[model samples]
Target chain A: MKIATYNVRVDTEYDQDWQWSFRKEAVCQLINFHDWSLCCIQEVRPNQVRDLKAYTTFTCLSAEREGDGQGEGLAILYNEQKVQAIDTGYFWLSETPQQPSIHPEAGCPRIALWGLFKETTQNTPFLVINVHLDHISAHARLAGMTVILEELHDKIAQYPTLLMGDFNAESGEEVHQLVQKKFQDSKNLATHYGPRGTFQNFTYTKPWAELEEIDYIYVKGWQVQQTASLTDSIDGRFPSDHFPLEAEVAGE
Target chain B: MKIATYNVRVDTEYDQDWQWSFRKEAVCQLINFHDWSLCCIQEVRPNQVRDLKAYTTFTCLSAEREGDGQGEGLAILYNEQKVQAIDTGYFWLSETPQQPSIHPEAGCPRIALWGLFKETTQNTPFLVINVHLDHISAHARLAGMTVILEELHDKIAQYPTLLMGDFNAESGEEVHQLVQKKFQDSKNLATHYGPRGTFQNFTYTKPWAELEEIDYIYVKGWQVQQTASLTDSIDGRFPSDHFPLEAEVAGE
Candidate 1:
């Protein structure tokens, strides 16, 4: 099945032409282009989540980092026909994950989600954890990823787990090393398509061939067939600041 | 301020390229084309409303005709930057106006909404009623219009109330006459643009030069600057089966 990690980019009036309003069309179009079985989304606000529900058939498991639902949130969007989530929950990437709390070093609040999804055809259940690492603090980025990974092993562990998100740290970066130490990067195992980088500021300053890569999908106990970063545009508009990282995998 | 009556068309997989998923972008695009102050919508499903909130800054007043949110719904989407909906509520168009009840003559259930909206700049308050008339039963269509009007005069009365919706019957038709008999048609007072007809069937078989007109804006206590049937398409994609009917009006 195909799964993707996408950062939709939060709604803001500052990014006039690339605002979420203009970019959502391209974002939903990109999802349709791939027809992903499950998509782990980051940087989404409350209304932005509704738009995703509006334009696509993906059912949402969502929670905003802030209790009020005004702040940026994390979600795992699954096409019910392909994957059925039996259990799902969210946790903050802080010392007290049980409640809404931010890491001391993190620039902003971050949240992560875990879902026990069963394949419709195979009926094989697997765990999927979605997270968004702290962008400002390398310290929080490492700590947050560590916290999520620790939870997977202790609290919500499953035989075959797929970890995905906007890591905010490119390959060989400090936070990337933490993931590489424990899990496998799908991109390194499979043929990488499009640009190597997943994060491209919507300025169109960088050439298409060589963009930045911060988003990733890390796998464990699964055979990775392929992985790629989506770089295509809709009418010359990028879907978001970061390209969606995609992977095709099968249970071992 | 500019106002519009838009039928988003229900969520249906059978429409193929004309489905809500494909048409919503173009629909939102059409709304942006005019920057409407308040858009009264019909034939919308729960998810489609989310899409409107997702792509625009318009705060929504929404409810499905059925008690459950699964059925076709009606909503008023107001750009908070332009209009502030001070009071909003919904009612069914049947003998039992207080609850969800469909007229026996109507093939399917229908709903209407009313809101006390204030112009952001002028701070002038006015009432707006939105409805979707029955397509199959002329009896229900006429009765529904009368019921909505009677309540407007008795329960939610306010000067310069603009009543808008898909009358189903075009100009001079049964239900159309009921509205015209008491209020002014915005199209009659303002310069008209695009094709005279608003229902295009999305078949392209009918030339864009002419189309069917059923959507309308009937106004009171307001000056009509202009009215239009939005016929422009995005990359040759029709926004919906029925084109949005728009009117620019100011408080008297």
Candidate 2:
């Protein structure tokens, strides 16, 4: 399975040069460039999602953290031709997972989405969980991570499970450490490629070295064949600040 | 009907001079001193509630925001002899309103408890909501205020309703302004007594003016007779950090 995690910042920003309107094509180009079986995304505004849908063929499960269909949200896109979804649900990181919610630890509300899918060609189903932790508060990120593990412990107990998202946490952060306890970081399992970091400021010049590696992909019951902090760009410019972390893996 | 909002700080603070142990007697004395029909309290640790039940004769609805039976939490104590509870529930302020919930906006998880009670004699029920807003984040406090109003909009549409709690917001603040929109502040309803403030630290020397008027009593479908920042003390000392807000009212 070719899986990826990306943070596509909402277009509304003070940084007008990197707005979604300007980067939409390249963003869609990078997404459509890959024959990804599953891709989890973060910070997708409703407007941006609409644009992506128009340009991309992948179907998605999207929900805003806010109860209303407002604010940046998470969306999990998949190649529907390869697999059919068996089950799906979305939840806030807060205790009451059912509603749009936030915790004091979070700078803003956060969300999680999970889907169970099976090969349309008569194969077993597996689970994929997507999340975007808070950027402002590490405490909120850690709490969000804990709840995801706690809530999905049973479903992920024994399956070819994959959890991906913009953790907003670097290698040694507590959020990363805790997540690594249950699942192997794909970067560690595969021969690393590209750069170590995933988030570089909106500059194609600085490169990924000086930037932060806040995003990650973790897996269970799978062999990571290759992993890369993909720094792909178009027209001498990048689509988003984050270099989507992509991984090639084979499930048992 | 006499109703009050008191913040009985949990017993585990380092401030031994003003701890719950030293003030439990006066806390009980003050509560028992008045035939309060309903008393909404915040910061009541589970142990304190048990102790409170031993010292005072009132039934209550209590839940810790941590979901467990721990932490300083909110409780609605009422005179069981006068009124019987008809319905009761507790919820977190976060969007999900889930059990054991916290939000990043809050310094700690905050909770709200609402109960419907009827006078045993003829059964005219009124809605009473108790809350303790975040002391750290005005944004969190305001969000908490919003959920209460949004959730209870219809529940309190026409009945005699009273919302009381440690608002942790002074006059003119957005939180108070927003809350005052639908419910009249008891302070502005009738002749006021004591000071203009509610939270005065743990000392009575600074006076409420030198401190803050954060706690509040809000009412709807009722006429306020008198309002007071109850400054009662035992041995010249207050029972907790805040001066309870007390109000006298009757159904319209």
Candidate 3:
């Protein structure tokens, strides 16, 4: 099965040139073209989530930042035809994993969504977790990593685990270094076809090597097939500021 | 079932502000947001077709302008999960229905696409035809209409028919008059919520009543559930120059 992580950027009126109205279609097209079985999306608003549900075939899970359904949220879209969700839930990345609160050092609310899915064709069951870490706080990022690692440590060994999303920290960062000790980075293990960096900041002309590598897809119990950063665009107009990262994998 | 008609313009290098790359996503989002079971699209190039296929769930049929795989084409995108194509084909608008040649006075090579679909739930079969008539030639537009009418007259009686696309002729024009004589204009028959005109010329400020009514969805032997023109935009950014016309219909 193939998986992808895209940071579509929040729906805001800040940039006239890169508004949601102009970029939503590109994002859908990019996701659609990649043929991803499951995708993790960050910085999506409630209306954007509604639009994604309205326009695409994939069904979204954990779409709200809080239980109340307002504010910028993280969503995981899974191909309804290919996979069946057995169970799904979300947990905050702060001291309290059960509620809608932020870490003191974190700039904003952070959360991780987890789902158990069964691939229809292969009849294989697996666990997938999607997360977005705090961009401004080193302490918050490290703490968030610790919570996820603790939560998944025992379950991952029993069930094959796939982790994805915008980590907001480079491979050399402490958060990245800590995660790499347990999970294998798919980009480093498989054959890749596009740019090395996942964050482009909407600069279409910049070479991929020069951009920062912040987003990633990590796996624990699957054999990596291929991994690449989706740098596809139309005349340099990309779907989002960050290029989506994808990985194709199979049972170990 | 919901059906829509969109004139996506051509793949052109002109107007960097409204290039195909910039507009394709908006078009796809509009199509997706409306939840169209089937859509008729005009002014598509081979590369654009590839992008559409890569980025959307709708499978296209008879998408080439010519029988060969080059040039601007007319396409019909259908939700493959919702409907199954029993049979599909295409025909030119010239005297000879099988060839790629255009009629005299035609601005460009014109073609019509037809599909017989079996709706999975109700097991109902219907005929859908998507076409783009000549913009420059009244004679060509009139002639094209005649050919489609003759071709569908017998089968339309057997199965409900939906004829949709950019006719390039206004409501008072002979082409529209002739089409209205046989098929029911969904926009005229139903309570519309948006603009009266389907072609907007990318003018956001212009009232819908001021724009020309060129694009249409003409149906026969189907009960018009509701019809509306989608005038949706993102911060004044429209999906295409023509506002997509949609119809929700059922068996009469």
Candidate 4:
């Protein structure tokens, strides 16, 4: 199965008439570019959801923080033909996770919405967790990554798994280190295709080919079938400020 | 002050990558048709809120039902310069109104999300309730309208009130008739400039002008300044499947 992770930046970076605006055309284009069966997305807005749902043909499940603000929610979409969402929810990686606070250390209500996917396409059950980390809190990132790894370990003991999304941390960052202990990142895996990098490929700044892989697709027992970055030429002008990550995996 | 009810359709029909689809761009175009201080919308899917927030420049409050099959909901978009929401919540119109359910009598899970706006620039705070009624149930529509009117009367007796949305009925249908008993229909008072007929137009079908008026802007203890059916046309094409209904209001 193929799973990709994208951060949409909430569709604020472009004009409505722009080809990639928050309409179905742009979102479907991105999905068709990779032809992913399941994808996890962060920073997506409601309109963006409206845009993507038609082409993906997947059942989308979203968790939002209540308020009348611009940026405050997370979502995960799965191909209903491949997996069924048994259960899912959102929780912050803070002292008081129930009442998430975007404080300096707590990561401002970053969430993990996960579920047990029975893998209708396959004979076994597995788990998939999609998360967006705290963008500005190093300590929160440190603690949040640990919590995520612990959860992954606990879940892996129960079922094989895959994790994907915008981590807000570069390769070898402390957050990445925490994850390295529990699972092998698809980026670091030795695949026929080389490592795929994400981020810093826009006119807003000079494109940086050397930026560490920040967006990711990591797995516990799923071996990488193939992987690649959706370049500007492939992804049109820019799918998002952050580049998208894709991976094809099989049960190892 | 202006108050309008628009069934903006929330970009729910199409997906993200369909470029030619009428979603964010069209939605923004519809918002430009009128300068409503308070806009009520129906059929707003959860994901569409992002595009609306980015494009409309208004603070929005919305209610959603269970599942993600493009299920209908309610939203209240208040102009920041005119009013601010003090409190907001959702309620069902069926016998078990506390929780959300697609009541057999109601046909769908009807929601009423009312906000207490403290009219930042006006005489006093008033209540604005936005609801999307049952589309296929005559008894449910009438009963729902009766409950809505009773609620409006209770609220308006204490303060001025305005109700807006797609009632799924014509001008004097059961729902509209019950609503008219308590609130005045603004369409009869002003010259509607946009498409006088339908709101949900499509490229496959004739233009928005081919559809008739099924949207309403009803008020109690409020004066209509000017009323018009919103033609959210962009490059001569309609914005959403449903057109917006706009009207200016003054306190009694």
Best by DockQ: 3
**TM-scores of the models, in the order given:** 0.50, 0.49, 0.53, 0.46
Q: lDDT tens digits, residues B11-110, model 2?
A: 8769766777888887876776554887998888888888878888788778777777777778888988877898998788877775666765777677
- For model 1, what is the alpha-carbon lDDT of residue A4? 94
Model 3: per-residue lDDT, tens digit, A1-252?
888888998888895878888887767755654558999889888888887887666888855656577878888899978888998878777778788887777876778888889888866678888878888967778988888877666666678888899888888889888887878899878666466687877775565467788888999888997786765553335668888888888977
Candidate 3 Cα errors over 4 Å, as ranges: A1-125, A137-143, A162-164, A170-252, B1-128, B137-143, B162-164, B169-252
TM-score, candidate number 3: 0.53
- For every candidate, give the share of true A-B contacts it also has: 0.00, 0.00, 0.00, 0.00
Candidate 1 wrong stretches, greater than 4 Å? A155-157, A208-210, B1-252
| Cand. 3: chain B TM-score | 0.94
Candidate 1 vs candidate 4: which has greater lDDT?
Answer: 1
Cα error, residue B57 of model 4, in Å, equals 1.3
Q: lDDT of all the models against the reference?
A: 0.78, 0.79, 0.78, 0.65
Model 4, position A237, has a per-residue lDDT of 38
The candidate maximizing TM-score is 3
DockQ of 3: 0.03
lDDT of 3: 0.78
| By DockQ: ranked, best first | 3, 1, 4, 2
lDDT of 2 at B213: 77
lDDT for each residue of candidate 2 in A1-252, tens digit (9 for 90 to 100) = 678998977777676777888888778767875548878988888998888788777897888777788777788888888877889987888877777777768777888889998766647788889978888877888999998988888888967888998888878788887887788988888566566687877766663358788888889888888776665554335678888888988868
| Chain A TM-scores of all predicted models | 0.94, 0.95, 0.95, 0.83
Total colliding residue pairs, candidate 3: 1
Residue-by-residue lDDT tens digits, candidate 4, A72-111: 5666777777777776756666555566454347635666
Winner on DockQ between 1 and 3 is 3
- Can you tell me the CAPRI class of model 3? incorrect
